[PDB]
Amino acid sequence: LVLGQKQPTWVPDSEAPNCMNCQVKFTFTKRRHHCRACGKVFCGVCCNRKCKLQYLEKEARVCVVCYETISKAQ
Ligand SMILES: [Zn+2]
Ligand SMILES: [Zn+2]
């Protein structure tokens, strides 16, 4: 994927026991969030900002990695 250019494969929650950035374990209250740019699964602290994604033509939640990568490209 060119980030933001096409919808990524979303990792199913059933296949995502830990934040794919910081490694924290998901729990009853530490819940899963997908990045709309890369499709990986994160805790809120690692995935809480939004940016405009071309394939959506609107703002969507992205992870720490994709945010910096895309917001610079914009
Ligand atoms: Zn995290
Ligand atoms: Zn991402």
PDB file of C-alpha atoms and ligand atoms in Angstrom:
ATOM      1  CA  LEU A   1       0.000   0.000   0.000  1.00  0.00           C
ATOM      2  CA  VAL A   2       0.912   3.624  -0.619  1.00  0.00           C
ATOM      3  CA  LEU A   3      -0.438   4.865   2.746  1.00  0.00           C
ATOM      4  CA  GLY A   4      -3.826   6.423   2.323  1.00  0.00           C
ATOM      5  CA  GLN A   5      -4.134   5.364  -1.309  1.00  0.00           C
ATOM      6  CA  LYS A   6      -6.106   2.188  -0.793  1.00  0.00           C
ATOM      7  CA  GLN A   7      -7.909   0.517   2.052  1.00  0.00           C
ATOM      8  CA  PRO A   8      -5.529  -1.789   3.987  1.00  0.00           C
ATOM      9  CA  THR A   9      -6.255  -5.290   5.208  1.00  0.00           C
ATOM     10  CA  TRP A  10      -7.539  -4.961   8.771  1.00  0.00           C
ATOM     11  CA  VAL A  11      -6.104  -7.529  11.189  1.00  0.00           C
ATOM     12  CA  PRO A  12      -9.132  -9.166  12.884  1.00  0.00           C
ATOM     13  CA  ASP A  13      -9.399  -8.440  16.626  1.00  0.00           C
ATOM     14  CA  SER A  14      -9.300 -12.210  17.190  1.00  0.00           C
ATOM     15  CA  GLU A  15      -5.713 -12.157  15.794  1.00  0.00           C
ATOM     16  CA  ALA A  16      -4.518  -9.130  17.778  1.00  0.00           C
ATOM     17  CA  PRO A  17      -3.692  -9.751  21.410  1.00  0.00           C
ATOM     18  CA  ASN A  18      -1.279  -6.765  21.814  1.00  0.00           C
ATOM     19  CA  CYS A  19      -0.800  -3.245  20.517  1.00  0.00           C
ATOM     20  CA  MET A  20       1.215  -3.475  17.347  1.00  0.00           C
ATOM     21  CA  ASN A  21       3.274  -0.428  18.312  1.00  0.00           C
ATOM     22  CA  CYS A  22       3.934  -0.509  22.075  1.00  0.00           C
ATOM     23  CA  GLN A  23       3.196  -4.205  22.796  1.00  0.00           C
ATOM     24  CA  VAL A  24       0.718  -3.564  25.628  1.00  0.00           C
ATOM     25  CA  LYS A  25      -1.804  -6.368  26.086  1.00  0.00           C
ATOM     26  CA  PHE A  26      -5.430  -5.598  25.220  1.00  0.00           C
ATOM     27  CA  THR A  27      -7.719  -6.044  28.201  1.00  0.00           C
ATOM     28  CA  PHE A  28     -11.333  -5.409  29.191  1.00  0.00           C
ATOM     29  CA  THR A  29     -10.584  -1.677  29.374  1.00  0.00           C
ATOM     30  CA  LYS A  30      -7.498  -1.352  27.160  1.00  0.00           C
ATOM     31  CA  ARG A  31      -9.336  -1.732  23.890  1.00  0.00           C
ATOM     32  CA  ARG A  32      -8.402  -2.181  20.275  1.00  0.00           C
ATOM     33  CA  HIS A  33      -8.283   0.548  17.611  1.00  0.00           C
ATOM     34  CA  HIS A  34      -7.452  -0.023  13.981  1.00  0.00           C
ATOM     35  CA  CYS A  35      -5.337   2.338  11.930  1.00  0.00           C
ATOM     36  CA  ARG A  36      -7.252   3.175   8.768  1.00  0.00           C
ATOM     37  CA  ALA A  37      -3.990   3.597   6.864  1.00  0.00           C
ATOM     38  CA  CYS A  38      -2.099   0.379   7.711  1.00  0.00           C
ATOM     39  CA  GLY A  39      -4.844  -1.866   9.121  1.00  0.00           C
ATOM     40  CA  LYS A  40      -2.875  -2.834  12.224  1.00  0.00           C
ATOM     41  CA  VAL A  41      -4.328  -2.801  15.743  1.00  0.00           C
ATOM     42  CA  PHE A  42      -3.283  -0.391  18.477  1.00  0.00           C
ATOM     43  CA  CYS A  43      -4.057   0.944  21.896  1.00  0.00           C
ATOM     44  CA  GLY A  44      -5.538   4.395  22.056  1.00  0.00           C
ATOM     45  CA  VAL A  45      -2.250   6.065  23.062  1.00  0.00           C
ATOM     46  CA  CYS A  46      -0.657   4.689  19.878  1.00  0.00           C
ATOM     47  CA  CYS A  47      -3.620   5.439  17.627  1.00  0.00           C
ATOM     48  CA  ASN A  48      -5.642   8.510  18.503  1.00  0.00           C
ATOM     49  CA  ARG A  49      -5.101  11.144  15.844  1.00  0.00           C
ATOM     50  CA  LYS A  50      -6.905  11.545  12.575  1.00  0.00           C
ATOM     51  CA  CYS A  51      -5.768  12.617   9.146  1.00  0.00           C
ATOM     52  CA  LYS A  52      -7.339  12.844   5.746  1.00  0.00           C
ATOM     53  CA  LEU A  53      -6.963   9.610   3.806  1.00  0.00           C
ATOM     54  CA  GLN A  54      -7.320   9.757   0.036  1.00  0.00           C
ATOM     55  CA  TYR A  55      -9.225   6.490  -0.316  1.00  0.00           C
ATOM     56  CA  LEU A  56     -11.867   7.718   2.197  1.00  0.00           C
ATOM     57  CA  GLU A  57     -11.841  11.387   1.182  1.00  0.00           C
ATOM     58  CA  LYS A  58     -12.257  12.219   4.881  1.00  0.00           C
ATOM     59  CA  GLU A  59     -10.454  12.215   8.229  1.00  0.00           C
ATOM     60  CA  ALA A  60      -9.873   8.865   9.871  1.00  0.00           C
ATOM     61  CA  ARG A  61      -7.988   7.428  12.818  1.00  0.00           C
ATOM     62  CA  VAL A  62      -4.348   6.537  12.205  1.00  0.00           C
ATOM     63  CA  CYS A  63      -1.471   5.151  14.260  1.00  0.00           C
ATOM     64  CA  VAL A  64       1.578   7.078  15.416  1.00  0.00           C
ATOM     65  CA  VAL A  65       3.652   5.816  12.457  1.00  0.00           C
ATOM     66  CA  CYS A  66       1.137   6.524   9.736  1.00  0.00           C
ATOM     67  CA  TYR A  67       0.204   9.924  11.196  1.00  0.00           C
ATOM     68  CA  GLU A  68       3.718  11.280  10.870  1.00  0.00           C
ATOM     69  CA  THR A  69       4.311   9.646   7.534  1.00  0.00           C
ATOM     70  CA  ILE A  70       1.013  10.976   5.993  1.00  0.00           C
ATOM     71  CA  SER A  71       0.801  14.405   7.654  1.00  0.00           C
ATOM     72  CA  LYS A  72       4.319  15.147   6.244  1.00  0.00           C
ATOM     73  CA  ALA A  73       3.276  13.926   2.745  1.00  0.00           C
ATOM     74  CA  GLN A  74       0.335  16.382   3.008  1.00  0.00           C
TER      75      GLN A  74
HETATM   76 ZN    ZN B   1       0.172   1.063  22.143  1.00  0.00          ZN
HETATM   77 ZN    ZN B   2      -0.875   2.838  10.727  1.00  0.00          ZN
END
